[PDB]
């Protein structure tokens, strides 16, 4: 779930970047460093909206590299356990369902799915229906789910869904 918080970071700037475009160069380096990455503390970062201020560059002793502890106002996406969101189904397989929560892909197994939703391997598009064939769930459909677990695979978040609670399907 997306949020807007204030973060901090420092980047070393090589002395070749000194000049009238110092602040512009610092901003450009900041943009291509903290966009799209992920951390286990704050979660996955989408992008940066604006920068608060530029700190005082403390030149290191014996080294021309100077660090700028910049504080930027960026957004972050850190889903937690128990949250309910609305995602889209990407692929339907007998092992389980595949979805895509923005910068995440979760996964629901057949055990989580109730017994009413059977398999349709005979039909060309992998789909799940009921006995009466009234409700149909397939790919490219806005299907909800519940985040019952979380995981970070070395700055690569991958949660797990569930389909036990009622009112989880077509709106």
């Amino acid at each position: 779930m997306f949020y807007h918080i204030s973060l901090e970071h420092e980047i070393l700037l090589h002395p070749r970047y000194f000049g009238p475009n110092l602040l512009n160069t610092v901003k450009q380096k900041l943009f291509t460093e903290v966009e799209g990455t992920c951390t286990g503390k704050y979660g996955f970062v989408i992008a940066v909206t604006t920068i608060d201020n530029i700190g005082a560059g403390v030149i290191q002793p014996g080294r021309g590299f100077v660090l700028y502890p910049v504080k930027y106002k960026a957004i972050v996406f850190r889903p937690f356990k128990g949250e309910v969101v609305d995602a889209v189904v990407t692929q339907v397989n007998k092992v389980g369902l595949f979805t895509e929560i923005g910068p995440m892909s979760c996964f629901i197994s057949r055990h989580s799915i109730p017994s009413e939703m059977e398999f349709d391997p005979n039909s060309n598009p992998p789909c799940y229906k009921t006995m009466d064939e009234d409700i149909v769930i397939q790919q490219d459909d806005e299907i909800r789910l519940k985040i019952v677990g979380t995981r970070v695979d070395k700055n690569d978040i991958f949660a797990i869904g569930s389909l036990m609670d009622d009112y989880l399907g077509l709106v």
């Binding site: 503390k41 989408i46 356990k81 309910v84 895509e100 009112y167």
Partner: protein, 126 residues
């Protein structure tokens, strides 16, 4: 221990600012509009494109004034910040569905008091 169902989060995340699907959608759209201009600039990555096409399929309302109105009519209540995002994004039909999906609403408020809010949210949708 981290479970949003029981309204618990780390200290850093407790002081965060909630965002709605339409809000993040328009923020990313404006960022794309700014970045596409000013040639000789590093183009967007696949993360930006996937987030855009993910948030564009759940934009209940395009007008920014709709976002302002729906946040203003909701902040007047005594619900926490976490209850401002999920309830305004999912837009459930009846109060029973909202209470079932979010266990925090069970016993926190009356039935008609939440049904009227859900009806207002549904009407605010474009």
């Amino acid at each position: 221990e981290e479970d949003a169902s029981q309204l618990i989060f780390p200290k850093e995340f407790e002081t965060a600012e909630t965002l709605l699907n339409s809000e993040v959608h328009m923020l990313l759209e404006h960022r794309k509009q700014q970045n596409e201009s000013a040639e000789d600039e590093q183009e967007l990555s696949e993360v930006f494109m996937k987030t855009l096409n993910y948030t564009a399929r759940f934009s209940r309302f395009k007008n920014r004034e709709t976002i302002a109105s729906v946040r203003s009519l909701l902040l007047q209540k005594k619900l926490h910040k976490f209850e401002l995002a999920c309830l305004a994004n999912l837009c459930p039909e009846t109060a029973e569905e909202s209470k079932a999906l979010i266990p925090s609403l069970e016993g926190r408020f009356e039935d008609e008091e939440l049904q009227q809010i859900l009806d207002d949210i549904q009407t605010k949708r474009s």
